[PDB]
Design a protein around this ligand. Structure first.
Ligand SMILES: *[C@@H]1O[C@H](CO)[C@@H](O[C@@H]2O[C@H](CO)[C@@H](O[C@@H]3O[C@H](CO[C@H]4O[C@H](CO)[C@@H](O)[C@H](O)[C@@H]4O)[C@@H](O)[C@H](O[C@H]4O[C@H](CO)[C@@H](O)[C@H](O)[C@@H]4O)[C@@H]3O[C@@H]3OC[C@@H](O)[C@H](O)[C@H]3O)[C@H](O)[C@H]2NC(C)=O)[C@H](O[C@@H]2O[C@@H](C)[C@@H](O)[C@@H](O)[C@@H]2O)[C@H]1NC(C)=O
Ligand SMILES: *[C@@H]1O[C@H](CO)[C@@H](O[C@@H]2O[C@H](CO)[C@@H](O[C@@H]3O[C@H](CO[C@H]4O[C@H](CO)[C@@H](O)[C@H](O)[C@@H]4O)[C@@H](O)[C@H](O[C@H]4O[C@H](CO)[C@@H](O)[C@H](O)[C@@H]4O)[C@@H]3O[C@@H]3OC[C@@H](O)[C@H](O)[C@H]3O)[C@H](O)[C@H]2NC(C)=O)[C@H](O[C@@H]2O[C@@H](C)[C@@H](O)[C@@H](O)[C@@H]2O)[C@H]1NC(C)=O
Ligand SMILES: CC(=O)N[C@@H]1[C@@H](O)[C@H](O[C@@H]2O[C@H](CO)[C@H](O)[C@H](O)[C@H]2O)[C@@H](CO)O[C@@H]1O
Ligand SMILES: CC(=O)N[C@@H]1[C@@H](O)[C@H](O[C@@H]2O[C@H](CO)[C@H](O)[C@H](O)[C@H]2O)[C@@H](CO)O[C@@H]1O
Ligand code: CA
Ligand code: CA
Ligand code: MN
Ligand code: MN
Lengths: 239, 239
């Protein structure tokens, strides 16, 4: 039984348990700002940032065929300061190949390079998409389950509570192969739920890096904040 | 596409859209008290009460083989006034044969007659169990998914926020056959999630009654309240 877990009630600058990539930065106030925020306090466009836990996770074993069950919880806030242009692009929790570097930003959220469903990506993600690309459903924002593609296999529209903290819970039961995610806004009491069957043995490599990635838009001011306040994770491999 | 829906932001006494059975009663304050509350304001033991929506729901069609997707949301509160004996028994959201009457109370929650897994029950339920019977896991309270039996196929322990309002969301996606439930306590911000694969065509009859049932214990003072503040439901049959 290989178990791994971590819990950050807040982030500390200089911490060596997190790998910051791109624009990602931990403020002195303990907040993880995935995307860049200017001197004037406004979110910068054309920005991509990621944060990966410093240790790889054993998600499944090819020898025994066993797969781990896991759960992650995190709180974030997205603030959209401008009426026009439309804000973009969103943030995502993901699992993929170890030692990875940021991919394409914008609508690809820093984890994909195109809009193809390619098995070589070996990536599983739960997105919180704020901009409707041609591969997206018309409603934004939306939660989406991404399996080797930015074209979600399942989406769930939600209403953004501008600048309010949202609580997220993502759980994966290896026995039933169900990936269930929940988004709750304590401010308004709104609850959103989404679930889909995902066999990680068909998607991910045995060892993966777990992280959070965020991206702002491809044009001036098509931006918003992607702030994370806490993040915990736990995985248990019967093997 | 056969759709049916209802939404009760509060309950009105005398309403003919709800079938009250057993001890169930709607107060002048708009609260649905599933189980009996004495003159002294304390919950009575040996009490069972149910509330069924007055119209049957078309859940699946045998001719076309199509099955409906549905979602229900409700708020309730359980108050446990005594340290001893242990409180009991809990409440449950259920779907089963039309024109049904209350079954055994106590640990059977008013919807089962024994602890056998019998296909003739044709009942699907999501319980919020407060007393650990011999067929129950040791942890209480717990959320459970019941399929033709009081012995849940899946359980999830949760911490009771005594007398606080809990918000529940239960969703069923016919395409994936996933039944996902969420319990949130706004008071503490606690979020609980549970999911399992359930093929309703193998469990329920084509037409069903949807309801809520609650029960108090088999001995003096083994009791608690089972108050419901609101309840909404919607189902869509592609046929
Ligand atoms: C957040 O970051 C923290 C800081 O990095 C993490 O804590 C570190 O976790 C390290 C485990 O990876 C741990 O490393 C060991 O350190 C031992 C010496 O330090 C302790 O003992 C000292 C006295 O002897 C004392 O003064 C210190 O205060 C510590 O108590 C050392 O003996 C160990 O070496 C043995 O094991 C390694 C690995 O098998 C062998 O390589 C080695 O030969 C020997 O057999 C080990 O040393 C580390 O070895 C690998 C090498 O690359 C590293 O440089 C070397 O440090 C380290 O002690 C702590 N640091 C502190 C200050 O406690 C923290 O990890 C979590 O908490 C720790 C305690 C542990 O339980 C981990 O499993 C947890 O993940 C990070 N938190 C998270 C959630 O990631
Ligand atoms: C909560 O309870 C409410 C009260 O019971 C529900 O509202 C009732 O819903 C009934 C539908 O089942 C509806 O019944 C129809 O009433 C028609 C006459 O009343 C209307 O028109 C009057 C003037 O003509 C006006 O004064 C009234 O105020 C109403 O506007 C009547 O013509 C209908 O009859 C036709 O259809 C039936 C069924 O096919 C045939 O049997 C009949 O031959 C004729 O063709 C119909 O009458 C009902 O027929 C069945 C019989 O057993 C009933 O006794 C008879 O009433 C009724 O009007 C309303 N009541 C009110 C005050 O609006 C409410 O239902 C929801 O809302 C209604 C409007 C409808 O949209 C339903 O689908 C909804 O479920 C309940 N809410 C919920 C969530 O359950
Ligand atoms: C100046 C201009 O019109 N530029 C557009 C880009 O904005 C556009 O890229 C999209 O931009 C939105 C935000 O406006 C999101 O970032 C989205 O993910 C991007 O794809 C591109 C391609 O559509 O076209 C011009 O370059
Ligand atoms: C007086 C006494 O000990 N009576 C017990 C019953 O309580 C018990 O039934 C259980 O009672 C608990 C609450 O105490 C729950 O209601 C539970 O669901 C019941 O099964 C029965 C059977 O165990 O034994 C005596 O009758
Ligand atoms: Ca998008
Ligand atoms: Ca029980
Ligand atoms: Mn999307
Ligand atoms: Mn139980």
């Amino acid at each position: 039984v290989e178990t791994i877990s971590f819990s950050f009630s807040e982030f500390e600058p200089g911490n060596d348990n997190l790998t910051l990539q791109g624009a990602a930065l931990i403020t002195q106030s303990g907040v993880l700002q995935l995307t860049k925020i200017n001197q004037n306090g406004m979110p910068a466009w054309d920005s991509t940032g990621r944060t990966l836990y410093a240790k790889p996770v054993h998600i499944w074993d090819m020898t025994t065929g066993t797969v781990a069950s896991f759960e992650t919880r995190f709180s974030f806030s997205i603030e959209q300061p401008y009426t026009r242009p439309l804000p973009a692009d969103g943030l995502v929790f993901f699992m993929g190949p170890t030692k990875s570097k940021p991919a394409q930003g914008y609508g690809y959220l820093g984890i994909f390079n195109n809009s193809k469903q390619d098995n070589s990506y070996q990536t599983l993600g739960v997105e919180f998409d704020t901009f409707s690309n041609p591969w997206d459903p018309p409603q934004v924002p939306h939660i989406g389950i991404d399996v080797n593609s930015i074209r979600s296999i399942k989406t769930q529209p939600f209403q953004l509570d501008n600048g309010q903290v949202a609580n997220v819970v993502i759980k994966y039961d290896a026995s039933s192969k169900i990936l269930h995610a929940v988004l709750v806004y304590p401010s308004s009491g709104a609850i959103y739920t989404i679930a889909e069957i995902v066999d990680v043995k068909q998607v991910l490599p045995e060892w993966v890096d777990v992280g959070l990635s965020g991206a702002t838009g491809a044009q001036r001011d098509a931006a918003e904040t992607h702030d994370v306040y806490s993040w915990s994770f736990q995985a248990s491999l019967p093997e």
